[PDB]
Amino acid sequence: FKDLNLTDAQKQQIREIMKGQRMRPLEERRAMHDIIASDTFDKVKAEAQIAKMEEQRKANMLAHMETQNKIYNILTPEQKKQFNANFEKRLT
Ligand SMILES: [Cl-]
Ligand SMILES: [Cl-]
Ligand SMILES: [Zn+2]
Ligand SMILES: [Zn+2]
Ligand SMILES: [Zn+2]
Ligand SMILES: [Zn+2]
């Protein structure tokens, strides 16, 4: 919870970080839908969908971690302590 006292130069540095981180769900939700609404459950078809979802997850996590890392490294040492304490309290 950005209680980090962000500097105005930090506020805009972050805004520029998000537009870049330092980039096939609909394709994914669609395939999920077709698995759920089928008369039967086909395990091998589901496993192929789960594998396809790992691709997208990989891209999304990489982008999310690199972004959060870029933000961490614009912080002052006191602000990094608060970032780190906040991290302990969030789940995502
Ligand atoms: Cl859908
Ligand atoms: Cl942690
Ligand atoms: Zn649908
Ligand atoms: Zn039927
Ligand atoms: Zn931790
Ligand atoms: Zn996160």
Side-chain angles (χ1 to χ4, degrees), residues 2-20 25 29-92:
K2 301 204 165 304
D3 48 356
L4 311 173
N5 296 312
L6 288 170
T7 274
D8 23 335
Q10 288 171 324
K11 249 94 54 35
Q12 312 192 66
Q13 276 176 90
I14 291 172
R15 287 164 210 165
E16 301 305 331
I17 277 160
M18 308 309 304
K19 262 172 283 178
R29 185 102 177 169
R30 200 144 299 170
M32 183 81 192
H33 198 180
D34 292 346
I35 288 169
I36 291 175
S38 170
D39 278 2
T40 38
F41 182 70
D42 179 344
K43 184 158 170 171
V44 175
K45 191 164 308 321
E47 290 174 312
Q49 184 49 213
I50 293 172
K52 209 187 165 197
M53 291 167 175
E54 291 289 324
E55 294 198 59
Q56 189 51 224
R57 176 162 181 290
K58 180 188 167 193
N60 287 339
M61 289 300 324
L62 278 174
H64 183 62
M65 286 185 278
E66 179 166 15
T67 291
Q68 291 300 305
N69 180 273
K70 275 173 172 43
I71 296 170
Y72 190 78
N73 281 295
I74 81 187
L75 303 181
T76 63
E78 58 265 50
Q79 297 174 305
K80 291 176 184 182
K81 295 196 291 276
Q82 189 60 49
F83 179 106
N84 283 324
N86 290 357
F87 197 102
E88 299 306 315
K89 299 174 279 190
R90 299 196 330 282
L91 311 101
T92 61

